[PDB]
Design a protein around this ligand. Structure first.
Ligand SMILES: COc1cc(C(=O)NC2CCN(C)CC2)ccc1Nc1ncc2c(n1)N(C1CCCC1)CC(F)(F)C(=O)N2C
Length: 127
């Protein structure tokens, strides 16, 4: 089976704004997660072909990854911080859905999610 095209990261027809919360999501949240020792499987779309997972895109219909999230942030693709937060949650929950409790990849996602939740708890108030 083929991989799907990666999620869209740019759309010239979308309105754009910068907010202190979206700036925080890029400068603090994404940066903190990216450098984590368990980040690397989440830094690009799942390549189901390379990984020989023919059923991955049969099961996961809303793929997401931190490479995509970062590009969306850099491109001012998001209008609301909540959109970006949803994309992180989609990434984590896709991992839990496809895989099984206790799997190494799940433990990796769990560590990132812990850190994510800590940083989102420190999200500054909308200015
Ligand atoms: C360079 O990339 C990899 C390389 C190798 C790699 O090189 N593995 C080697 C390990 C040692 N043997 C000897 C050869 C292959 C393994 C995994 C990689 N990448 C990856 N990215 C993302 C996911 C994932 N993997 N998952 C893992 C679970 C276990 C097998 C895929 C399952 C998943 F479903 F796709 C998933 O949810 N995510 C989040």
């Amino acid at each position: 089976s083929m991989n799907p095209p990666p999620p869209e990261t740019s759309n010239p027809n979308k309105p754009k704004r910068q907010t202190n919360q979206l700036q925080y999501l890029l400068r603090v949240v994404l940066k903190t997660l990216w450098k984590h020792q368990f980040a690397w499987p989440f830094q690009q779309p799942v390549d189901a072909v390379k990984l020989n997972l023919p059923d991955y895109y049969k099961i996961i219909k809303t793929p997401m990854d931190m490479g995509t999230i970062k590009k969306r942030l850099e491109n001012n693709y998001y209008w609301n911080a909540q959109e970006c937060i949803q994309d992180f949650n989609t990434m984590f929950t896709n991992c839990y859905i496809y895989n099984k409790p206790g799997d190494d990849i799940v433990l990796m996602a769990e560590a990132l999610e812990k850190l994510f939740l800590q940083k989102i708890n420190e999200l500054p108030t909308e200015e």
